[PDB]
Design a protein around this ligand. Structure first.
Ligand SMILES: CC1=C(C[C@@H](C)O)c2[nH]c3ccccc3c2C(=O)C1=O
Ligand SMILES: CC(C)=CCC[C@H](C)CCOP(=O)(O)OP(=O)(O)O
Ligand SMILES: [Mg+2]
Ligand SMILES: [Mg+2]
Length: 315
């Protein structure tokens, strides 16, 4: 339980403990599948994993609340950022209550791990900019999204994973880039329906494809050779990044390897789903997790018997 994990982490402040408890329950609500990854980490690290993942998912969710206007979503980002900065520098609606718990846990997590907690607004600004960006002219323009929304939190959580070599950050950047590019491809139909194109226009031009072509053909039952070749190209670009980043687990502390090995393997499993049966994925509309938890429990206890201990909390 989070209470025993907080005990093992040495987090004793009753106000802070309550915030980590709130965040852990929120984490479970934002997705049980992702929440279970916490059990691949040493018990005393799970409060930090909870707080960091919840922060990224919580803020990204503010940005992708497609029920509401871009103006409303922008206001929510401003609200969370104001609350974060108030906490960082030392009746409530439900969103105000969660904003504050997420912020308080995150500040403590970031300071515990020697991360630049005052730069969190750069991540929020990337999300604010993404709200009003519906197209990307080329790779350089898409990098404005990737280097703020995607990879800034990625290089931060890399430190929480306890890198053993300097190559870890580049492997982290390749791997999470591949994950993000696969998300764009997987979600192409939904994103197109929202008026957003995350495939750079230069790539479309290269294969003679228009945005209208994609809008009309994805989910239509058929694909022209040009559209299929564009999809093949984008899938191959994601594959190349994943292959370049695949050594990331070995560059991390042993207690972090099982989680990222499982996550890489999950994304590996997306490639045949996208392409099989002649790209049928684009024409029409638990076991791995249990095994990884089993493997992680062996590795983590080994590491403990070898003297491993999670660092002391910021206080
Ligand atoms: C640590 C991590 C991360 C890093 C994140 C916690 O900042 C991640 N970012 C993503 C963007 C799109 C699709 C997947 C990811 C992921 C992960 O799967 C992951 O494990
Ligand atoms: C999954 C993780 C460790 C952190 C969350 C980063 C981001 C939220 C994942 C994208 O996956 P996803 O749930 O599909 O978001 P999306 O709907 O596409 O904007
Ligand atoms: Mg998506
Ligand atoms: Mg998605």
């Amino acid at each position: 339980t989070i209470v025993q994990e907080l005990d093992q982490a040495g987090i004793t402040d009753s106000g802070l403990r309550a915030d980590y408890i709130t965040v852990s329950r929120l984490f479970r609500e934002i997705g049980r599948g992702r929440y279970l990854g916490r059990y691949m980490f040493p018990a005393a690290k799970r409060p930090y994993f909870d707080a960091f993942i919840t922060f990224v998912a919580y803020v990204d969710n503010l940005t992708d609340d497609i029920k509401h206007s871009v103006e409303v979503r922008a206001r929510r980002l401003d609200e969370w950022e104001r609350t974060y900065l108030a906490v960082a520098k030392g009746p409530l609606s439900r969103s105000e209550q969660t904003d504050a718990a997420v912020a308080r846990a995150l500040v403590h997590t970031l300071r515990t791990w020697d991360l630049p907690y005052l730069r969190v607004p750069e991540f929020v600004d990337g999300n604010r900019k993404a709200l009003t960006t519906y197209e990307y002219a080329n790779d350089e323009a898409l990098d404005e999204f990737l280097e703020t929304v995607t990879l800034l939190p990625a290089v931060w959580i890399n430190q929480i994973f306890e890198p053993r070599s300097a190559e870890a950050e580049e492997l982290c950047r390749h791997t999470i880039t591949a994950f993000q590019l696969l998300d764009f491809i997987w979600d192409l139909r939904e994103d197109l329906d929202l008026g957003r194109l995350y495939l750079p226009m230069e790539h479309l031009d290269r294969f003679g494809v228009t945005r209208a072509d994609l809008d009309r053909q994805i989910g239509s039952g058929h694909l022209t050779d040009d559209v299929r070749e564009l999809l093949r190209f984008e899938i191959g670009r994601a594959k190349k990044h994943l292959d370049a980043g695949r050594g990331w687990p070995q560059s991390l502390h042993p207690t972090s390897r099982t989680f990222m090995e499982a996550d890489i393997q999950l994304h590996d499993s997306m490639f045949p789903q996208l392409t099989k049966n002649g790209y049928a994925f684009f024409k029409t509309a638990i076991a791995r997790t249990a095994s990884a938890i089993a493997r992680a429990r062996k590795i983590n206890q080994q590491a403990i018997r070898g003297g491993y201990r999670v660092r002391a909390p910021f206080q």
